[PDB]
Each structure stands twice: as structure tokens, then as C-alpha cells.
Design a protein around this nucleic acid. Structure first.
Lengths: 187, 147, 128, 124, 52, 52, 52
RNA sequence: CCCAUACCCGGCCGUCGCUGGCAGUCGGCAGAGCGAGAAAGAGAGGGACGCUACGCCGCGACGAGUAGGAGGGC
RNA sequence: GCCGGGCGUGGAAUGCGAGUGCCUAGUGGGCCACUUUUGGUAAGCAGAACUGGCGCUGCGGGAUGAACCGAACGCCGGGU
RNA sequence: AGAGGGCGUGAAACCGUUAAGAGGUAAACGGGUGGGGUCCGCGCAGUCCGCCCGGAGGAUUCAACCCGGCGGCGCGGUCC
């Protein structure tokens, strides 16, 4: 008789990707090796991020990484992002880049490579930098999905600016009693 | 796949995943969206505020084509023309500014949502905002109206 | 004179009797195959003294001797002579077993071929 | 490539057979017939294969040349060996050890050849 | 009921993706063996014959 | 080369199709893991087994 | 795929003629069984007859 | 002095944890180590087994269960 | 309210990795006991507080026993 | 005909019979052994495997060379 609780002794985390993609499953075979035989904690983060679901590795825009690479103590390092690099049409000039991502959209290749940049894949990243030396590990906006605007405290609550689920928006869809001070009350 | 569904794992278990005490009866709370002002009052206040009541003017014969005005921001304004057009202006030395016909692309109103590259344009649109007019003027362009 | 295995370890089983379904003796509609009782008052379910035993994972045999025959081998079903060339490199670990529906003219080709490849057969003296 | 194609056939191939809690591969040039990465014959660019001789006396050793990789008609080279037991073992040991041709398979291919030679030895 | 959803639809790019992955695996002389095909003697795997 | 095209020459007989991209160029990690670039950045294998 | 090899056309009698065709780039596409097994087990449902 | 499914000791099964270890099978293009209390360099001027990596291996700790939930079913 | 600069003996003992977000079933008749306690002559009565039980739980003991005393359970050998 | 005119296969409940065993706390069951059958083990003189020594044989016989063929690697430090 031991007085403990087995409620949360099984840690909930991914230990291998649910995806059956063999090219993804080959990368994990490569980085499982690099994570445990190098003391570099960079590879442990990349290993953990390869397991994650698509909703946990959101796309990195092209202008976001430009915004993060124009920071001072940089511009020689390499851009490493486990998600995918989409092209941002609302930026005009493109500096030359050294990018490593899982997947690059067709327009974002042509716009990067036209600027004399360089696109890398994760097998070529390990060849050029095994321990992750001189790289900047980035991530797209994780809570930028439309879904999180419904989360939080429920709507119809004091100071709970949360988007409700409505089948269509209009003047006669959730503009009455809970919302107008003239109709009953409001929050 | 019926072989992946839950009912395959409920075979043998008596209540079939619906409890012995509170059995799976036909309709315990009523059919549909019932009890709005009644025994389901809390659910409609906590998750659908504003569901009950009327507001506004009843417009009878709404013809959606009249109120049609698809806007375009100034951020993606140059995406309406080719990259050849955008480069041949910064290379041009006569000050010759390209004309962007917005209506041709499909939009009507121009709103100014961001920065602009400093080279003049003459946007042939149908509606403008105030701030949108400022950005185009301040760059050095012109705002021409068309119907 | 037999084809002795690699090593013959002392097999030790935690239980040798089968598990019977609850009340499988009192009825003929209740077959012997184990079904976990889910009744709310069932004695067997709530582990009373002197009842039928419920199979746990605690009765799991040793992994060193799991699926091991008394002869220190492990079975492998075989349908034709071509499915024997697999086992010519596991001679001291895996025995061969000719499948049921293999005819009598094909059984007396497998057994002596399995005598050439030195693979043990668990049902050699077949229909014959 | 080799590591790639293994993922495609690790669990779905016409040479794989699973039953009785075991797993086997009936591939031609797969000594030990094991469903393994090392021992698969279709996967790698350099494979070793030891089959019984066509008459029933001796062994043939199958090596795979490196030139023809997508030309299967000429890729595999076979050399029939019919010598004594100590000489046949030393001949297939030198083709592996003194050619650097899957040196992790020398002892494994020696077992298979010895097992074949003992089979071709007269029965009691 | 007759109005069970029988037919399924797949994106046109994935339909084209599957043709790419199918043709490329018909160029590896190892996957064609594992599919069963007795081609242990064919001269070259991406077998091309004359227009005659 | 006209129904699917190369990676730098889009397919002529499709609307705007082009081949899919590769998620990793150098596929065989065997030739990778035995490289001097990797093998210099690895701590020594602690393979001496420790039983109770 | 640092290069695309050269495939030889075979004549009607089995010999290899003088001509040589460049290996098309489609044969170098990624090998995705998961997509092939997805697309195949969703296009096989479109020839299906109803029953009720 | 007697004995419980409790406690100690030992075996075996399983789960959980160490997000543990192993691509180093590096062989006459060889030279067999990384259990070491102490932030860091065995640095250059003919030879068993193995590793279905979705595999294998080592340590600890833990194990009741209706309604209910999930995972695995060669 | 801003900047800027300087100070770690981490300023009680003990123990332990935490934080955080989704989706969510069942339930919404309970019952018993030490102590406190209201109505009632009282009740295996009705109604509460606190904690633990039973329900969902076998086991050793109380001959017998939903709740008491001990003690909570993978399958086994030895000891206690 | 162990396919005999509602006739392919011919299960269970149930019944008849034969064979075996038992029989005053209804039967049946769990755990533990014991006895008895049943067949099986094709059990009954119990291991092969290398390696070296000793004694009797028999081969076309080893090493090293010569010619032909095939293969591997090449940092040929930089072959065409």
C-alpha cells in the first residue's frame, strides 16, 4: 500500500510523428541520432518540433522571417523553421537568405532564389551544420488560426471579447438581448 | 470505416457507453432548439448572447448586387499588375507612372492598409477612403475616379 | 536421436489450467471461452474468495520461453517445400509444422526435404 | 535509394511472410531469410547470396556489380563453387573480407554456405 | 439506403501526386520485385521499346 | 516530360502543373551518418552495458 | 538527383538499338506510399454500384 | 506462539518513467577505450551475436475498480 | 510614470518538476460512523456541519454481516 | 445406402444402449494434490559439434607458378 496518485504519471507528449510520411520518417531517423549523440540542445528542439501536428507547426510567412532577420546581431546566420515558408505578397524587396524549412511554396522559392538566396532542407542542414551552429530557429504564428478567437472565456460574459459561433452574420444574428442595453442587458 | 468506430469496442459492455443510471432515452431535454426561454436558459446566455429579439430596420427586397463593393488594400495593390510593370517604373527616368486599373482586377473600393513603395501610380478605381487617398498622394501618385 | 534445439531452458508456467467462462458448467449455451463478467453483483467480477479466477496480465509467461513447445522449439506453419528454405538458418530454434490441408503426396516431399535441411518437423508421421 | 526503398517494403512486399509470431522474407539473395535491413537483398547496392548449386553439389555465390543498378539482367554475377568444406568456406570468406564487400556479412554468409554443404552431404 | 455516400472526391493535385509516386516506383528495380513481378532477367527496368 | 515536366520546366500539356518537391534531397542516411562532418561533432558512444 | 541517367530503347527482337532517351524527371519524384494508398482507396469507391 | 492479497527479500508479467542506451559491425587504407566523484583534447605543427531503428537493450518505481474515457489486438 | 546605474549569503523548516490550452463522457435518488448538532418521547426516523468510509472493494479479524478493527489487490517462493 | 424416394452435409437440446467410474448433507464449481483410465511419447540403453593427437586406408591432391575469363577498389596523390 503506497499513498500516491497515478492520475498524471503517464506524460502526454509525442514520441514519434503520427504522420506516415516516409521522408518525414527518414528525417526523424536522422535527428534521433543527432539529438542523443550531440550535446547541442538545438537538435532536441528540432526533434521535438518534427513530431508535432500541422496545427502546431504553422506556416512562417516570408515577411515575418525578413522582420526577424533584420535584427542586429544576425544577417550571417541561417534561417531554420520546422514548418513551411509561404510567400508574402505585401513585401517588395527581398534580401538574400539562407533558409532551411520542411517545405517551401512554389512562389516563395522563386522569390527567394531570384534574390540570390539559398534554400536548404534538413538533411543538408545537418551536413552543413550538425550542432546547429549559427542558425536562428523560428516559428510561425501559432495562435494565428481562426479557431482561437472562439476560445477563452465564453461570450455573454463581462469583458469576454470572444467570437461566438453563428451560422451567418447580420443584423439579426446575435445582435439582440445579450448585446444591447436596450434589450434586457449587456456585458 | 465501421471497424475504426467506437461501437466495436463497446460490444459486451451493457449500457453501450451511455450509463446505467441515466439511460439513453429518446429525448430528455426536448427536440431541436427547445427551452430557449426555459430549462435551457443558461446555455443560450452563456454561448449565444443576443439570440432572442429584434433590432434594426426590416429591408424587404434585398438585392445583393446593389450593395456590391469588394475592397482592396494598398498593401497588395501592386499585385494587381505584373512584376514587369513594377520594375520598369523604378528603372524609368521620365517619371512615367503606371496606371493600375482596380476595377479591371475586380475590386471597387481602395482602402489604405499599409505601406507603399515610393513610386507614383494613377489608380483607376471607383471609390477611395480618406487615408487611402493620403498614401497615394504622399507617395506622389494620383487618385482618378471612374464609373 | 532427435534434432535437439539450441538451448533447452526449463519452461515454467504460472498457470496450466484453462480459464473457464463464469457458469459455463451450469449451461450448454454458455460456452467455455472466457468472457469477462460485467454484472453489477457478479462474484467473479469482484474477486471473491474461492471463485473462478479472472485472467490478468500477471499470468504472462516469460518472454524467454514464450510460444515455446515442450521440445524447446517454436512452431512455424508450412504449406509447401518452398516455404521450408526460409527455416534452413533457424534450425536450432524454429521447428516446422506441415499445414492440415496439405495432401499426402505433398507431405512425403516436405518431410525428407526437411530431413535434408535438418529442420525438425512436429507432425512427420502424417496421413502417410 | 536503399534507406528509402526499405520504408516502402518494410511491411508490404510479396516476399514477406508473417505467421506464428515470426516474420520472414523469402527474397532470393537474403541469407538468414530475415525481414531485416542488413539482410535484404533487393534493397542494397552490394548484396551477397549463397544458393545451392544447380546440380545439387556445391554452392553458387551471388555478388551484385555496381555498374548495372537498374539493369537486373546483368547486375548479379554468380560463381559456382564445388570444392571441399574448408576450401569453400575460405573462398567465400576472401570474396568478402579481401574485397570490402559487406564485411558485416562474412560470418553470416559462412553459416549459410556451411548449412548448404552439410545438406548436400549424404543423409543418415 | 441508396443515398449512402458511395463516391469520393480527391484533390486534382493529389491525383497527379499519386501518378508521380507510382511512376517513380516503377523505375526502381527493387520495388517492382517486391510487387511480385518476375523480372529477374529483364534487360533494363524503365523498359522502352520501338514505335514499331 | 510534357505531361508532368521537369522541376524547372513546367508541364506543357497540363494547365499549370509541376512536379512535387522533395522534403529531403539526400535520402540515404547511411551515406550521411558516416560522413566526416557528422562524425566529428558526436560524443563517444557509451555502449558499455550496465546491469544491476 | 544530381543527374538523370540515359535509358536505351530496345528493338522488337530484344537487342538494344543505338538510340538513347533521357530519363524523364517524373521518375525522380518523391515516393509516397501514404498518398498512393490514400488516393487508391478513395478512387476505388467511384466505380461502385449502389445497393439497398 | 498462530496468520492477510499488508511489510521485507527473490523470480516472472505488464504499465509508467529515465522525453535512458545503441547507426561504432569505424579490421594488414586494421590496432579492439570513453563507469570517468570534480566547466573541457586517447587533437594536429585471421576476429561470435547484433540494428523487422514501428528494432533491440539497461535501469528504477508502480499494479483495486462500477458508470465513463482511451490505447493495443499476429 | 519613465529611463540609467549599483547590490545574490536566493534571506524560515520540510517535501515535490511545473505551467497552460483545447475537446469531453458519466453524474446531478445516495447512504453509514466518531465528534458538533436542530425537530421528535423515541426510532434501523427526519434535517445539517467536519473528516473518513460504503457506493466503485476484494483481503485478515468481529461465528454470521454493504459501513466496525486491521489493511487496500499483477502472478508466485521464503521470512515477518 | 455410413446417398434408400421430404433421400447432400447431419450440430445442440433430448433419448436409447454399450464401456468406465461414482453414489446418504441436491447438483455443479474454485484451489491443491492423490488414485484410475485414455491415448501419446513411434520412449527403452541415450548427446552431438568443432579443434588437436594416435593408428589403419582411399584420392589425383595442397602451396607456389603459367594461360584464359569474371569481379571489387582506385587518393591514377592531379589517366583519357
Amino acid at each position: 500500500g503506497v499513498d500516491i496518485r497515478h492520475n498524471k504519471d503517464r506524460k502526454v507528449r509525442r514520441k514519434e510523428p503520427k504522420s506516415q510520411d516516409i521522408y518525414l520518417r527518414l528525417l526523424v531517423k536522422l535527428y534521433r541520432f543527432l539529438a542523443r549523440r550531440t550535446n547541442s540542445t538545438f537538435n532536441q528542439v528540432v526533434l521535438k518540433r518534427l513530431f508535432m501536428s500541422r496545427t502546431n507547426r504553422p506556416p512562417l510567412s516570408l515577411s515575418r522571417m525578413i522582420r526577424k532577420m533584420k535584427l542586429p546581431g544576425r544577417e550571417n546566420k541561417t534561417a531554420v523553421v520546422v514548418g513551411t515558408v509561404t510567400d508574402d505578397v505585401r513585401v517588395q524587396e527581398v534580401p538574400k537568405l539562407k533558409v532551411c524549412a520542411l517545405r517551401v511554396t512554389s512562389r516563395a522559392r522563386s522569390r527567394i532564389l531570384k534574390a540570390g538566396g539559398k534554400i536548404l532542407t534538413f538533411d543538408q542542414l545537418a551536413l552543413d551544420s550538425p550542432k546547429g551552429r549559427g542558425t536562428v530557429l523560428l516559428s510561425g504564428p501559432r495562435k494565428g488560426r481562426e479557431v482561437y478567437r472562439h476560445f477563452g472565456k465564453a461570450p455573454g460574459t463581462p469583458h469576454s471579447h470572444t467570437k461566438p459561433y453563428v451560422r451567418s452574420k447580420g443584423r439579426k444574428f446575435e445582435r439582440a438581448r445579450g448585446r444591447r442595453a436596450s434589450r434586457g442587458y449587456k456585458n | 470505416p465501421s471497424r475504426l468506430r467506437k461501437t466495436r469496442k463497446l460490444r459486451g459492455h451493457v449500457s453501450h457507453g451511455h450509463g446505467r443510471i441515466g439511460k439513453h432515452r429518446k429525448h430528455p431535454g426536448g427536440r431541436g432548439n427547445a427551452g430557449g426561454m426555459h430549462h435551457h436558459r443558461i446555455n443560450f446566455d452563456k454561448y449565444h448572447p443576443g439570440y432572442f429579439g429584434k433590432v434594426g430596420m426590416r429591408h424587404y427586397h434585398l438585392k445583393r448586387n446593389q450593395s456590391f463593393c469588394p475592397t482592396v488594400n494598398l498593401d497588395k495593390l501592386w499585385t494587381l499588375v505584373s512584376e514587369q510593370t513594377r520594375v520598369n517604373a523604378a528603372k524609368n527616368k521620365t517619371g512615367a507612372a503606371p496606371i493600375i486599373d482596380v476595377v479591371r482586377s475586380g475590386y471597387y473600393k481602395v482602402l489604405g492598409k499599409g505601406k507603399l513603395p515610393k513610386q507614383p501610380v494613377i489608380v483607376k478605381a471607383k471609390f477611395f477612403s480618406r487615408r487611402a487617398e493620403e498614401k497615394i498622394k504622399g507617395v506622389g501618385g494620383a487618385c482618378v475616379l471612374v464609373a | 536421436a532427435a534434432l535437439r534445439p539450441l538451448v533447452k531452458p526449463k519452461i515454467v508456467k504460472k498457470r496450466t489450467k484453462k480459464f473457464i467462462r463464469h457458469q459455463s458448467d451450469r449451461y450448454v449455451k454458455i460456452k467455455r471461452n472466457w468472457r469477462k463478467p460485467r454484472g453489477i453483483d457478479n462474484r467473479v467480477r469482484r474477486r471473491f474468495k474461492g471463485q473462478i479466477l479472472m485472467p490478468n496480465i500477471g499470468y504472462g509467461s516469460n518472454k524467454k520461453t514464450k510460444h515455446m513447445l515442450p521440445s524447446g522449439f517454436r512452431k512455424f506453419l508450412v504449406h509447401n517445400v518452398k516455404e521450408l528454405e526460409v527455416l534452413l538458418m533457424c534450425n536450432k530454434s524454429y521447428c516446422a509444422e506441415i499445414a492440415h490441408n496439405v495432401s499426402s503426396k505433398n507431405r512425403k516431399a516436405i518431410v525428407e526435404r526437411a530431413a535434408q535441411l535438418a529442420i525438425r518437423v512436429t507432425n512427420p508421421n502424417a496421413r502417410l | 535509394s536503399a534507406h528509402l526503398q526499405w520504408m516502402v517494403v518494410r511491411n508490404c512486399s510479396s516476399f514477406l511472410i508473417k505467421r506464428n509470431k515470426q516474420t520472414y522474407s523469402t527474397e532470393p539473395n537474403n541469407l538468414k531469410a530475415r525481414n531485416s535491413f542488413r539482410y535484404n537483398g533487393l534493397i542494397h547496392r552490394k548484396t551477397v547470396g549463397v544458393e545451392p548449386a544447380a546440380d545439387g553439389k556445391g554452392v553458387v555465390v551471388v555478388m551484385k556489380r555496381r555498374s548495372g543498378q537498374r539493369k537486373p539482367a546483368t547486375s548479379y554475377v554468380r560463381t559456382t563453387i564445388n570444392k571441399n568444406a574448408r576450401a569453400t568456406l575460405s573462398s567465400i570468406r576472401h570474396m568478402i573480407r579481401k574485397n570490402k564487400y559487406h564485411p558485416d556479412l562474412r560470418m553470416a554468409a559462412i553459416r549459410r554456405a556451411s548449412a548448404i554443404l552439410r545438406s548436400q552431404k549424404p543423409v543418415m | 439506403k441508396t443515398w449512402r455516400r458511395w463516391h469520393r472526391r480527391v484533390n486534382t493535385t493529389q491525383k497527379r501526386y499519386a501518378i508521380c509516386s507510382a511512376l517513380a516506383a516503377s523505375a526502381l528495380p527493387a520495388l517492382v520485385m517486391s510487387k511480385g513481378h518476375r523480372i529477374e532477367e529483364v534487360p533494363e527496368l524503365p523498359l522502352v521499346v520501338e514505335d514499331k | 516530360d510534357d505531361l508532368y515536366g521537369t522541376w524547372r520546366k513546367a508541364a506543357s500539356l497540363k494547365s499549370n502543373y509541376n512536379l512535387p518537391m522533395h522534403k529531403m534531397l539526400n535520402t540515404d542516411l547511411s551515406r550521411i551518418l558516416k560522413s566526416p562532418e557528422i562524425q566529428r561533432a558526436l560524443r563517444a558512444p557509451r555502449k558499455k552495458i550496465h546491469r544491476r | 538527383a544530381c543527374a538523370r541517367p540515359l535509358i536505351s530503347v530496345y528493338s522488337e527482337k530484344g537487342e538494344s538499338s543505338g538510340k538513347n532517351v533521357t530519363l524523364p524527371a517524373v521518375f525522380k519524384a518523391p515516393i509516397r506510399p501514404d498518398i498512393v494508398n490514400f488516393v487508391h482507396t478513395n478512387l476505388r469507391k467511384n466505380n461502385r454500384q449502389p445497393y439497398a
